[PDB]
């Protein structure tokens, strides 16, 4: 059948937060989940027209010394159009996490499994499952290298050969 | 088995043989069948390590006036390492065809079904099912534009992110 | 029967990363998994001709203070010939991990269970399941002593007595 | 039937040659002569990589096929010397064409290895892959050869030794083609 | 078992190779190109004595056998030229390898001879002996070849003519040996 | 039970007895049967701690002219500690053979099937099933070259990495 099931785990974001610039509410990461953001899924969506996100998980992997103060709040807004970047908006989303800067965590988001479009278009809601937003909570004492990883699983349909 | 089955038709070769240059035995098309040669299988092998050829057929679709002279012989050598490019080598193999330049033909070859490698290596026998050769039979009279297409079906395995 | 099942856990790599030299993308570990790299499996493959890797896991055990910044990305390329040493290439592999320098992790790779050859030869793909690559992510503040361990399980066949 | 601009080609049976041929035979893969005293322990009397070229009729048959599978493979060490000859031989078929280990222990480790005196003949019934091998040569010879037969001296030979190493082979050839060296 | 002066030889399967092999195939026995005007009446386009050497796989197979019998023999005249070409050809298989008569009447006298236009393909179903022939060459070639296939022009060709002469052959090989040229 | 069963034939001893030196009772071969004596079992015991002898047979294969004089007596003492090397000790044991120098014989001995230790220790009775002795009977006339081979089958246990 045209449907092929792919899974993988890749880094959606890499950010560096210097010491003291991580004020409360600062936006460390704001990544709109698109197939191009994921390498293997990037090629897979380059050879397909439609994709549906069966499973989606995120892993916040901040690489900082244990003596680092402050923390982060990480969430997955299931609306690509939504631009709210406050603590309450993230915490309202299912699976959002709050953790110290030296404590890696996992986000298990909730979203609607609809058949999306691999290629971009006018309406972003038909192409992306949502956005991942990672904000600072409090103040960080050291420099934090944050890697945001995404464990994904998709179903691909309508074969084609697209261009970026 | 997280094996992805992918299939489709794609042009492996495009050749423009000018009138008068198509002497007998001239190698119009010489293509070692690797996934990088195929457009969609190119990306599929870019995101996978291993592939197995389940279905392989070649379609010689030359576009020239019906009053043109000469012909072609097309054949699939199941050995990628073999470098013999003559009418005898093509006639020995199975699935080979010989037809006039205005005719469209199908080569149904004898190919290995083992698990080959998408990337290149020291031994070509572990990476390609074989090569396809299209030669002139006689001398052409008009300008011939021959496109060699391939209906292929593969099974892909061992996810990765390869480079050209 | 000739088939004997062996398992074990041994250190494939020992590396020392001084303070500040662990720049992002630096290659800490690049080990081609061969039976000689594993002591007990080294002797076992010295008394056999063929081996098949039934189970393969890796444990990254970096020994550094909790106040160490930066991290690592560890992966198992299931292609011994592949020489890509970038973050995306590792992350595309199944089971790849990203972690802080003071956080031990485990890699559960995916690979094709084919009957390999214990002794070396021209084509490396017939002798090795792949390579383990461990790269730096960000900058390390302290000195990191990294031990890369491999928990393996093999099936051995075709008895012989080989020499190194 | 009207006259067309061009008629369709009428070549029908093209690319339909025979695919499988079973070929059996027996041939001398080696012949060695040893003057007295030369056959010290460990001396390599015979070292022959079993390939279609080594067997003449199989070589000619493999020149017109792409792949071959060894259905049957057996060897005979037939030394034609009297019973007053001292010393002996060890013979074994290494299933790895690449391995070049030439010792008593390496041969004895293999299945079917024989240790005999120079006035005794033996049959080596070895362990060989049944998988399809390539008739033509390539970069890796593990895809083209089932292995190599090795024959060493165990002790010093008192007299001259004439040893002939024979092979009964049965093969199935497949994927017809026309190979050239 | 007492120790004798010498033991009997234990070579058993020697001289027991395969005797009969049926080999079939199809090959181009000739290829000719004719520029405009050269193909006058009676011009000998093709003159090929059908021997195992003419057929490559059959040549290699006959190098390891002594005798062969032609079970099936058919020829195809396949001229790859347009329908606007003038002239024609006569094709026939003379069952006598020695006869070198190259005329229209000599070819037409034989059974299965075909007369066609240059834009028409024909199949020659000839008359050939089923008796055992010798794979290797000798003084008299009537014992080694079933005959010769001959192809002449009937009229002047207006355009260039490319003609390929093919052969479907089936043979049974017997009396195994190892021939050398 | 992660017990590895390994078997094969290997030469335990190679002796060159020159003509005239083979007086009656001369100890041609004296070998305490330990896994280090066997070539392939050498590596097998190098990667294991304990072994149990399931099958043990010795093959005396002397290579000499049929007109040579004298003979040999071969026997397996089931006690490694025993130091009696005489015809009487060999004739007392079971499985012993006596034959002319041109004859090839098989000693099927009486050996313990308990779990012995691959390494050496204070007590030899916990490490070896016994010893094999090959003695001269009479005086030889020609130079004798005797190889003592052993068909052995063992069960190995308790993985380790031993030293010579
Ligand atoms: Ca699209
Ligand atoms: Ca690769
Ligand atoms: Ca080997
Ligand atoms: Ca070939
Ligand atoms: Ca002859
Ligand atoms: Ca020990």
């Amino acid at each position: 059948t045209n449907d092929v099931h792919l899974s993988g785990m890749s880094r959606i974001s890499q950010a560096v937060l210097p010491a003291g610039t991580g004020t409360d509410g600062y936006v460390v990461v704001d990544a709109t989940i698109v197939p191009d953001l994921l390498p293997r899924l990037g090629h897979a969506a380059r050879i397909f027209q439609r994709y549906a996100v069966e499973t989606l998980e995120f892993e916040i992997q901040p690489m900082c010394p244990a003596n680092t103060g402050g923390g982060y709040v990480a969430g997955f807004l299931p609306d690509p159009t939504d631009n709210d970047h406050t603590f309450d908006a993230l915490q309202a989303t299912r699976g959002a996490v709050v953790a110290k800067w030296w404590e890696s965590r996992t986000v298990r988001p909730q979203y609607t499994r609809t058949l999306l479009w691999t290629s971009s278009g006018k309406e972003q809601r038909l192409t992306s499952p949502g956005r991942l937003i990672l904000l600072c909570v409090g103040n960080n004492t050291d420099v934090v290298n944050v890697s945001v990883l995404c464990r994904w699983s998709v179903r691909l349909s309508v074969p084609s050969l697209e261009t970026p």
Side-chain angles (χ1 to χ4, degrees), chain A residues 87-120:
Chain A
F87 190 100
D88 54 356
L90 282 178
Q91 195 61 231
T93 66
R94 184 74 163 274
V97 298
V98 179
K100 297 177 288 294
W101 271 127
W102 48 280
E103 178 205 293
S104 66
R105 291 273 290 261
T106 196
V107 172
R108 281 75 178 272
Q110 170 177 353
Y111 62 91
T112 300
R113 305 161 155 231
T114 56
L115 183 63
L116 299 171
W117 294 81
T118 61
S119 66
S120 179

Side-chain angles (χ1 to χ4, degrees), chain A residues 45 48-50 117-120 158 160-163:
Chain A
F48 274 105
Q49 292 276 16
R50 313 289 295 286
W117 294 81
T118 61
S119 66
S120 179
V158 190
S160 66
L161 186 57
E162 306 173 336
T163 61

Side-chain angles (χ1 to χ4, degrees), chain A residues 3-136:
Chain A
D3 290 7
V4 298
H5 291 252
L6 269 193
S7 50
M9 184 177 177
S10 47
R11 182 170 68 180
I12 56 184
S13 179
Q14 175 61 80
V16 178
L17 189 67
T21 192
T23 66
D24 193 359
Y26 173 85
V27 189
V28 192
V29 168
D30 193 14
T32 296
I33 306 305
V34 287
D36 291 331
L37 203 54
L38 310 168
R40 292 184 67 256
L41 186 49
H43 300 276
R46 191 161 181 179
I47 72 177
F48 274 105
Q49 292 276 16
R50 313 289 295 286
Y51 78 105
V53 185
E54 293 179 353
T55 300
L56 201 63
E57 310 179 56
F58 301 94
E59 293 83 3
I60 314 297
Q61 296 289 339
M63 293 180 183
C64 76
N67 296 115
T68 306
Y72 60 87
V73 56
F76 178 76
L77 260 56
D79 207 295
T81 64
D82 276 9
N83 285 354
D84 195 2
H85 295 155
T86 53
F87 190 100
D88 54 356
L90 282 178
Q91 195 61 231
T93 66
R94 184 74 163 274
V97 298
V98 179
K100 297 177 288 294
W101 271 127
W102 48 280
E103 178 205 293
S104 66
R105 291 273 290 261
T106 196
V107 172
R108 281 75 178 272
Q110 170 177 353
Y111 62 91
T112 300
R113 305 161 155 231
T114 56
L115 183 63
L116 299 171
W117 294 81
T118 61
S119 66
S120 179
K122 298 293 183 182
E123 181 56 86
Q124 189 150 36
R125 281 167 172 174
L126 304 173
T127 67
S128 177
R131 293 143 68 64
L132 181 140
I133 312 99
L134 173 70
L135 306 173
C136 290

Side-chain angles (χ1 to χ4, degrees), chain A residues 120-161:
Chain A
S120 179
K122 298 293 183 182
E123 181 56 86
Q124 189 150 36
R125 281 167 172 174
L126 304 173
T127 67
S128 177
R131 293 143 68 64
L132 181 140
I133 312 99
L134 173 70
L135 306 173
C136 290
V137 181
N139 296 2
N140 60 331
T141 72
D142 289 330
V143 56
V144 191
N145 198 1
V146 182
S147 296
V148 188
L149 295 173
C150 176
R151 178 190 280 104
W152 50 267
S153 177
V154 296
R155 180 183 52 86
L156 299 166
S157 296
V158 190
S160 66
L161 186 57

